[PDB]
Amino acid sequence: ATFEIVNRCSYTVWAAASKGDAALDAGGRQLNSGESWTINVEPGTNGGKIWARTDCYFDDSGSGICKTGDCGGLLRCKRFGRPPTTLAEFSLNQYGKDYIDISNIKGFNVPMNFSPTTRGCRGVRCAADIVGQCPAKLKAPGGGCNDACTVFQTSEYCCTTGKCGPTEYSRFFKRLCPDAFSYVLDKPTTVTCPGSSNYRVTFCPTA
């Protein structure tokens, strides 16, 4: 499957793509404002994620650091990124269908639209100014808006036991972005697409 990743932000981002235990395609790449990078994701990929990283510095070997979404200091991500990270999430060719969503469970750093470029389903978007409106206690000093689990490490925010409910913090993310997961047990906003659909992830779709 192809995923065209487009940076419409006025700032550079370093896109990342991983399924947690491996990179998807090259795993990461710099996208200056306006640039597009198309990756190929193997059919059947389960639990894949794409996200933006901000304020990165990498040496000639591809090692360094980003202020949001850093994946073990690598330009080419092999693992998931450090919160806060707005997440485009997908599982492909799962009993014949693809499943996509956007999640704020690991916080928010950059607004995004995640849409199919082929027919059969709609896209999802979280493009509100979550960082600007972020509750004081969730503001990440390194940049972005942290989720409450990251900040407080409680069973209720992290849904450790699996019986958690919505919280004042999850409701903030949900109010700003109704179409993205705000906590682990949020009413699903996952979209079912035809198996083997193709997609486009756009950072700063509206601004």
Side-chain angles (χ1 to χ4, degrees):
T2 64
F3 285 69
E4 180 185 15
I5 304 172
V6 181
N7 181 19
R8 189 171 293 149
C9 305
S10 63
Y11 46 87
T12 299
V13 300
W14 284 259
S18 172
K19 65 180 185 78
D21 63 348
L24 299 180
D25 194 285
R29 210 204 78 175
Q30 183 172 326
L31 283 183
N32 294 144
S33 174
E35 294 194 321
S36 301
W37 173 41
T38 301
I39 63 170
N40 290 93
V41 176
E42 185 165 26
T45 292
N46 189 73
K49 305 188 193 300
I50 285 162
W51 66 103
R53 300 173 284 172
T54 60
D55 306 322
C56 305
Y57 290 91
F58 293 112
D59 60 25
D60 309 320
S61 70
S63 294
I65 187 169
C66 302
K67 294 191 178 190
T68 63
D70 195 67
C71 60
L74 304 182
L75 167 62
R76 287 174 165 72
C77 296
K78 281 195 298 286
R79 293 170 45 249
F80 292 141
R82 188 171 187 279
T85 51
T86 316
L87 299 168
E89 307 185 308
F90 47 91
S91 292
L92 313 179
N93 310 283
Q94 299 300 306
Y95 298 110
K97 295 295 183 182
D98 293 355
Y99 294 90
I100 67 170
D101 70 75
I102 289 171
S103 174
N104 286 137
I105 291 167
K106 291 288 172 174
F108 177 104
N109 64 159
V110 174
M112 55 155 63
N113 178 93
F114 180 17
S115 292
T117 53
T118 51
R119 20 73 64 184
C121 57
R122 41 73 143 64
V124 290
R125 178 180 293 195
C126 175
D129 188 11
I130 282 175
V131 180
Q133 303 296 357
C134 190
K137 289 186 175 308
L138 298 183
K139 291 171 181 282
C145 190
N146 290 311
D147 59 284
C149 171
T150 290
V151 178
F152 297 106
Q153 297 282 277
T154 66
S155 293
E156 192 65 16
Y157 296 136
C158 301
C159 296
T160 313
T161 70
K163 58 202 177 180
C164 66
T167 65
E168 273 201 343
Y169 296 125
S170 71
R171 287 186 188 93
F172 158 74
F173 289 95
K174 197 59 163 187
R175 178 172 62 82
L176 278 273
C177 283
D179 293 336
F181 281 83
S182 63
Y183 72 106
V184 176
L185 294 181
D186 205 350
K187 173 184 176 53
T189 43
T190 303
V191 171
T192 303
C193 289
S196 297
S197 296
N198 293 318
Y199 304 91
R200 176 180 287 120
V201 175
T202 306
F203 300 121
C204 300
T206 60

